[PDB]
Amino acid sequence: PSIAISLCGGLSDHREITKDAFLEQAVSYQQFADNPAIIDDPNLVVKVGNKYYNWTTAAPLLLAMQAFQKPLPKATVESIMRDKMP
Amino acid sequence: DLPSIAISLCGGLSDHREITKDAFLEQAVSYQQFADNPAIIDDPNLVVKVGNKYYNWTTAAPLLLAMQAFQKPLPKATVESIMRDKMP
Ligand SMILES: [Cl-]
Ligand SMILES: [Cl-]
Ligand SMILES: [Cl-]
Ligand SMILES: [Cl-]
Ligand SMILES: [Cl-]
Ligand SMILES: [Cl-]
Ligand SMILES: [Cl-]
Ligand SMILES: [Cl-]
Ligand SMILES: [Cl-]
Ligand SMILES: [Cl-]
Ligand SMILES: [Cl-]
Ligand SMILES: [Zn+2]
Ligand SMILES: [Zn+2]
Ligand SMILES: [Zn+2]
Ligand SMILES: [Zn+2]
Ligand SMILES: [Zn+2]
Ligand SMILES: [Zn+2]
Ligand SMILES: [Zn+2]
Ligand SMILES: [Zn+2]
Incomplete structure (x- = not known):
């Protein structure tokens, strides 16, 4: 899957994330490299x-893809979002 | 192109013990262990x-995010600074 990061926010208010925002x-990359605390x-x-x-939520999803070269099971992702999403 | 990643529960970094291949x-x-317990x-x-x-x-978290999101590892000087901040 395509992966990117942004500082738009909106998750903790349960706002829908639009492509534009x-x-x-x-x-x-350079921005994150200059300030990895982001x-x-x-x-x-x-x-x-x-x-x-x-x-x-993304950390275990991401860790699994790189460490095992495949995504986690669908039931696992549902459980992580249930546990970890705002 | 990206470097390989593995994870273990051997511990020892925060006591500054040397991480041995065997340990x-x-x-x-x-995979199934992490899939069954993502809280690991x-x-x-x-x-x-x-x-x-x-x-x-x-320490690994920003390295992992940069590799996935940008498809390249962070610069070596950046990783060194993360280590200074986050390694035990
Ligand atoms: Cl912000
Ligand atoms: Cl489903
Ligand atoms: Cl379901
Ligand atoms: Cl979880
Ligand atoms: Cl949990
Ligand atoms: Cl343990
Ligand atoms: Cl433990
Ligand atoms: Cl344990
Ligand atoms: Cl240990
Ligand atoms: Cl120390
Ligand atoms: Cl210490
Ligand atoms: Zn901020
Ligand atoms: Zn389902
Ligand atoms: Zn959980
Ligand atoms: Zn443990
Ligand atoms: Zn100890
Ligand atoms: Zn250096
Ligand atoms: Zn730092
Ligand atoms: Zn120490």
Whole structure:
């Protein structure tokens, strides 16, 4: 899946993330390299495919894809979102 | 192109013990183990191997995000600074 990060926010207010708002505050590589603490920003949104996650939800999804070269099961993702999404 | 990642619950980084190949692999986390317990990511004993080096989760997290989101690892000088801030 395509993956990107942005500081648009809106997840904790359960706001729908629009492509336009996401892109207006997308984080570039150099920007993240200059300030890696961005990973802890409350407004950080992670785009994974068509969905938008907070970092706490995206982290296991992402860790699994790189460590095992395949996504987690569908039932696992549902459980992570249930546990971790705002 | 991206470096390989493995995870283990061998621990030892925060006591500054040397991470041995045997200790890492004997307690390596498998796909089904992580799929059954994704909270392992918060386990205090989690060690993340990135290429040749061993990190705790707090250090590995930005490395992992940069690789996935930008499809390239962070610069080496950046990783060194993350280590100073986040390694135990
Ligand atoms: Cl912000
Ligand atoms: Cl379903
Ligand atoms: Cl279902
Ligand atoms: Cl979870
Ligand atoms: Cl949980
Ligand atoms: Cl240990
Ligand atoms: Cl534990
Ligand atoms: Cl445990
Ligand atoms: Cl443990
Ligand atoms: Cl120390
Ligand atoms: Cl210490
Ligand atoms: Zn902020
Ligand atoms: Zn389902
Ligand atoms: Zn959980
Ligand atoms: Zn100890
Ligand atoms: Zn444990
Ligand atoms: Zn250096
Ligand atoms: Zn820092
Ligand atoms: Zn220490």
